[PDB]
Amino acid sequence: GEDLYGICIDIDEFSKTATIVPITNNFEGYLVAKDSTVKVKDKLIFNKDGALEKVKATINATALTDAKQISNEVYLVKVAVFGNKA
C-alpha cells in the first residue's frame, strides 16, 4: 500500500534479521507474486501481504518475466522496481 518502506532481499533466521533495500534504491530481481495472472510489461502493486499483484500504483514496478511456480503457493516473478510514481 502507501506504507511501503522497502523490500526484504535477504533473511537470517538464526539472528532473525532481515536485510532490506530501501525504496529509494532501484532493484531488479525475483519477488513473490499473488498469483500466476502476471505477464510481461505489466504494472504491479504490492498488496497488504507484501505480494506483487497485477494492477493507483504509488510505486512503478514492471514485470520482466511471467510468474513461475515452484510450490503450491510459491510464485516467483522477475521484477524491476525503480522508485515511486506521482
Place this chain on the structure above:
Amino acid sequence: MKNPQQDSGLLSNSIDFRDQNLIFSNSGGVCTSSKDKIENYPAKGYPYKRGVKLSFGDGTTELEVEAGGGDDLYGVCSDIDEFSGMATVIPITNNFTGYLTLKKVNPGDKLNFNQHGELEKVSVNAIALSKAHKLTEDLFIVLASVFGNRA
C-alpha cells in the same frame, strides 16, 4: 553523434579556459559522486543526453532503452558507446546534475521530460540552473539538476 564525425579543418587554440565546456561532446555530469549507480543498456535510436524509458520486445530479445519521458521515464542517458550500441543510464532514483537536451527557459524554472526525452517547462523532474544554450539550429542544451519525480 556525441563526437563530431566530420574532421576539423584547424587546430584548436588551447589558450583560453572559459566557456570551453558548452559542447555536445561533454559526457557525464558537472558534479559526479563515486557512489552513483550506473547501468548499461542496449540503445534504440540515439537517446544521448535525453531521458530514457524501458521498452520490451516480443520476448525473443531482452529489454532496451529508448528516448522518452512522461510517466514511462526510467532514467537519464549521460553517455553512449557507439561501437557496442550501449547507453549509460543513471536511474531516476539516483539524482543527476548536468547538461541535458532542452526543447527548443530561465534559471529556477521547473522542467519535465516530454515524449521525446527533451526537457520542457511545466509532476516536475528537474530545476533549470541556467538558460538555453544553442549548439545547432535545433540543438539546445541546459544545465539542470534532476532529483526524481515529485508532484
Place this chain on the structure above:
Amino acid sequence: MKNPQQDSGLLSNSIDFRDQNLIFSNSGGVCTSSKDKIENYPAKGYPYKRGVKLSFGDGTTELEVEAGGGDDLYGVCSDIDEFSGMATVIPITNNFTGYLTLKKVNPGDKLNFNQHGELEKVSVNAIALSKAHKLTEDLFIVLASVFGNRA
C-alpha cells in the same frame, strides 16, 4: 553508393562464374573500346549510372553535372570517385553500352532518359538489350546501348 559501405559478414564463395555481374558496383561498360572519349566533372548529388546534364552556378564556381535528361542531356555517368566528388562522363556524341538505371520492359524496346536521369519506355536515346533486373526495392538496372539522339 556504388560500393556497399556496410561490411559483409561472410566470405563469398568464388566457385561459380555465372550471373556474377548484375551488381551495382559494376563500373564502366560491358564492352569498352580503347578509343572512347572520357571526361571528369564535379558531381552534384549522386548521378552514378544515370544520364547527366550540365548545370551552371552563379558564375563563381565552374560548371557541374547533375542527374537529368530530356533535351538537356549531355552524357551518361559510368563511374564516380567519392573522395574527389568526380563523376566520369561519356559524351552523348560517343556511344555507350552497359548497365544503366531504369525507371521502376523487354529487349528491343526504345528507351529515353527522364528528368531524373532514369531510362523509360517511349526522341529515342537507347535500346534495351535485356529485361529489368531488381537490385533493391526501388533500384532497377537494365543493359542498354546508347547511340546518341534521333527522333
Place this chain on the structure above:
Amino acid sequence: LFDENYYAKAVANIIGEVKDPIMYKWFSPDQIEDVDLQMGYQKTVKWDAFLNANPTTIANEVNTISTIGFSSEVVRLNYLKLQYKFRHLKQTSEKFYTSDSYIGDINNNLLPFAQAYKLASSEIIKLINHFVLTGTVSIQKDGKNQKRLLPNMYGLLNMPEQIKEEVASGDKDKMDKIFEKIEAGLSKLELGDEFSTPMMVIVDPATSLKLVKPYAAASSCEKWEDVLIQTIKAINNREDVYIETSNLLKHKILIYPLNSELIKFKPSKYMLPTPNEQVDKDSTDVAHSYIDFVLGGLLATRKTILQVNIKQS
C-alpha cells in the same frame, strides 16, 4: 604478487581443476587461431572477378572488346567483452566457517573464493560453448530474453546464407523424410576445390537414437547412420566423417567441413574466463569478485553449412 594477493594465488592453484571446453572437439587443431583483442573488430578483404558479357571473336579489325569486372568484399568480425560478479567468503573469515567436512555456510550459500571461482568459471565456459554452438546467448530453456549482440557475431547454427532444411511436423518421426531433407541439403552444399576434407556432424540425442534403427522392409547390417556416413563420404572424397551428440542441440542436425580454408575460429586470447583485479571488500565477511570473458570470432564461407531443423510443433 602471490605473497601480497591471496586471490591470485588461489586462482593459480585452482585453475587446473577447471575442465576443458567441449567445443574443442567440434573443430580441427588448425581451424582455431587466437587473436589479441578484448573489444573491437578485425576486418579482411577478398577479391573476386566476374565476366561482363560473351567473348568477342577476333576477326578482321575490331576495337570494342568484352570486359572482365572485379569486386572487393570486406568481412568484419566483431568481439564483445562481458563480465559476471559473484559473492564469496573473506580469506580471514574462512577459519570461522571451516567445518570438519564442508567449508562455507550452508544456510547462507556462501563458499570460499577458490570453490566459488571454480563453479563460476565452469558455468561461464558452459555459456561460451552454448554461444559458440547456437549463436545466441540466453539463460532460459524457452530461449527467450536473449542478449542483444553486435552484428557480425554468429555461431554455427545461426550463420546466414547457409543451406537450411526443414522437416515438417507430420514427418517428425519419419527417418526416411529426415534423410531425404539431409540428402537435399548435401546436394545443395558447395565445397568447390576443398571437397577433400573431413566432415563433422552434430546431432541431438533423439536424432542419434533414430539413427541406429535399421535402414528401410528392414535391412541387414545396414543402418541409417551407416547410410548417412556413406552419403557424406560420397561428397567429401571419401574422407573421415565424425558424428557427435550434444545435449545443447534439440531437433537440429548440423553438418560442416573441418577445413580451415572454409570455416575458421579466430577467438580472442582472453575469450576464456579471467579473474578481475577489483575485489569489493566491506566490514562484513562477504566479498565480491568479477570474471571477464570475450565472445565472437567465427568466420565461415557462404553455402558451406547444412542446418536441418525438425519442426516438432
Place this chain on the structure above:
Amino acid sequence: MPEQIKEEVASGDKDKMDKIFEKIEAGLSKLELGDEFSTPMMVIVDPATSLKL
C-alpha cells in the same frame, strides 16, 4: 534404488527379443545423464538373458 527408470516386459512377450529391445530402448530414452553422458556404460544380465542375447 529409488527414483530410477523401471521397465516391465509382459509375460506373453517374455521370449520376444524384439519386445525386450523395445522396452530397453524406451528405458534408454527415459535415461537422463546430463552433461556426463560421455561415459562408459555397464550392463548386468542373468544367464538366461545372456543366452537369449
Place this chain on the structure above:
Amino acid sequence: ASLLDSNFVPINFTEFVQAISNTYKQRRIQFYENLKR
C-alpha cells in the same frame, strides 16, 4: 610464462593474466595432441 611452470613468479596482475592465457593455449594444444578421433 604459464601457470603450469612452477618457476613462474608473476610480478603483477597483467603478467598473471598473460600466464593464464598462455596456460589456456597450452591446455588446448595438449587436448588436441591427446585427441585420437
